[PDB]
Symmetry: C2
Subunit: 320 residues, 2 copies
């Protein structure tokens, strides 16, 4: 009485950010979002449901995870079991390769295999969405858009065809180590929706940002793409400074990196930064200028702190 499955899902970085839920129960977002899936960072997850198990177990990189570390996985296991009318505890074994988007997407894929759900990419995106919003985009490779929809049935992601432009781009991660303890993405976006006087200004600008990203993609206009997404990310972070109590995901090193990206642009290197719910700074750059950018940034960051990535693929399912 054992069912198992495995999947590999790559991380994605949002260029137009998801920030705030319209519906917490179903993870329907207040706004649509758009990301790039990356080759360098992914998660492999195997799930086993077994009648003989006595509790849910979650192992990450060989380390048994505690209740707090397992909360999103546990919530997802419960929702997928409820849907399938499955009454068995589960063991989840995940390995990160170098992580929230990729891990929940991989778990959704692994459960789809184990429980025989036979889901389409659309409906696998919808399932992954229930575990974590950003996870629903990692079902897809390259550029992907999460359409906010208005319901559980209409909120999901899809690949954005780009005439292979994504294969000419790169993201250079600047790994910043000097951060305060940060509000989680789930708690921070909720605080922002509920209390930030800047949130309406965020919402009022998302759709025209998305439209201009699509225009830039159709024309492979890198500076235009970069200007839109850099401003989008800064606007997202601006909202947390208007929350009550206000907060920031930035650390000192984040600001240092952002300032150096501006310097890089001033010295002829077209490149544009974005940040998520933490201090790391991701820099979008054309492949042809990646090495120039890495060398420039090495004047201030160690080679361990500068990790490159190219575009990556959508989810891969495996039978056990």
């Amino acid at each position: 009485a054992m069912l198992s499955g495995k999947a590999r899902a790559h991380t994605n970085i949002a260029l137009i950010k998801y920030w705030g839920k319209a519906n917490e129960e179903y993870i329907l977002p207040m706004n649509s979002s758009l990301s790039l899936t990356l080759d360098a960072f992914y998660t492999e997850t195997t799930v086993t449901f077994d009648a003989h198990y006595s509790e849910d177990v979650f192992i990450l990189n060989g380390i048994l995870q505690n209740e707090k570390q397992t909360k999103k996985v546990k919530e997802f296991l419960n929702l997928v079991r409820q849907q399938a009318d499955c009454t068995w505890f589960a063991k989840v074994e995940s390995q990160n390769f170098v992580s929230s988007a990729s891990g929940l997407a991989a778990l959704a894929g692994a459960c789809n295999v184990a429980l025989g759900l036979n889901l389409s990419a659309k409906d696998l995106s919808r399932l992954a969405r229930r575990g974590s919003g950003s996870a629903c985009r990692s079902i897809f490779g390259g550029f992907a858009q999460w359409n906010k929809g208005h319901s559980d049935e209409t909120s999901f992601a899809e690949n954005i065809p780009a005439n292979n432009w994504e294969n000419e781009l790169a993201m250079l991660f600047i790994l910043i180590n000097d951060g305060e303890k940060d509000v989680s993405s789930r708690d921070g976006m909720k605080r922002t929706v509920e209390t930030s006087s800047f949130y309406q200004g965020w919402l009022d600008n998302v759709e025209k940002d998305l439209s201009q990203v699509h225009e830039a993609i159709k024309t492979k206009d890198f500076p235009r793409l970069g200007e839109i997404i850099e401003a989008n990310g800064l606007r997202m972070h601006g909202t947390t400074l208007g929350a009550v109590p206000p907060f920031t995901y930035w650390s000192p090193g984040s600001l240092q990196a952002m300032a150096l990206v501006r310097q890089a642009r001033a010295k002829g290197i077209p490149c544009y930064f974005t940040m998520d719910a933490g201090p790391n700074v991701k820099v979008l750059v054309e492949k042809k200028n990646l090495e120039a950018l890495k060398t420039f940034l090495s004047e201030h960051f160690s080679k361990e702190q500068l990790v490159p990535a190219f575009a990556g693929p959508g989810i891969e399912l495996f039978e056990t």
Copy 2:
């Protein structure tokens, strides 16, 4: 054919920020503001109007100032001469003691003396306002409020009686040296008014902040004062991240200092930060905890970077 006058004016730091003009010509503000005038930093200015002068001259700390460095002083000289129907060039000699608010306030006072304008404190505040908005508050000591008014006649500052509470407080300046070239306050607030999607959220919160500062003052409630003004400052800076193009006054060291103030609070030291249009971080603290705070911050900042100030007086006029 020579007329001269002198004044000394102390700097002030806004606790509720002035950010954005309703009328650029007259420097009428979009919102009212509230500051504390400080003892440690001031400017002394002597002005001479003389029929024999061949151009306006501005000397600051013994250094002849160029056209860009003189622009606010030149604009003020022109407006005060036009009002007085004075046709003489002027020499302005200023010394900073340790600077925009204090320098323009001192110049307004010196011109009031030289040209025999015989202004009340209210009308001297109105005059100084035309040179720089923050200068109109340095006419007064202690706590001062700039009431936005609706006209040149109704926009001016006044002292806020506080039953001597201001004499129990201090500001510790953390002097941060790692800053990018920053947009001036005048240009940055204009860009924010004209382009920031967050500016309405700023405006919608100013008056209730002011009201709660007045309530806290009446009760000498330091944590309440501190919470309101820290959030006000962060909200002001949040608006620049929604401007087009977006920008920040923060440097890495600014973030480091803000994080350490939060740490100080966590370790039992009540203290609250605020920033203006630059990277320095000013920390409001009770006098009784100033030395504890300075020692704590010395773990990360040099003793030259930590400069204390207490409450200071209003403008002082001198005959030459």
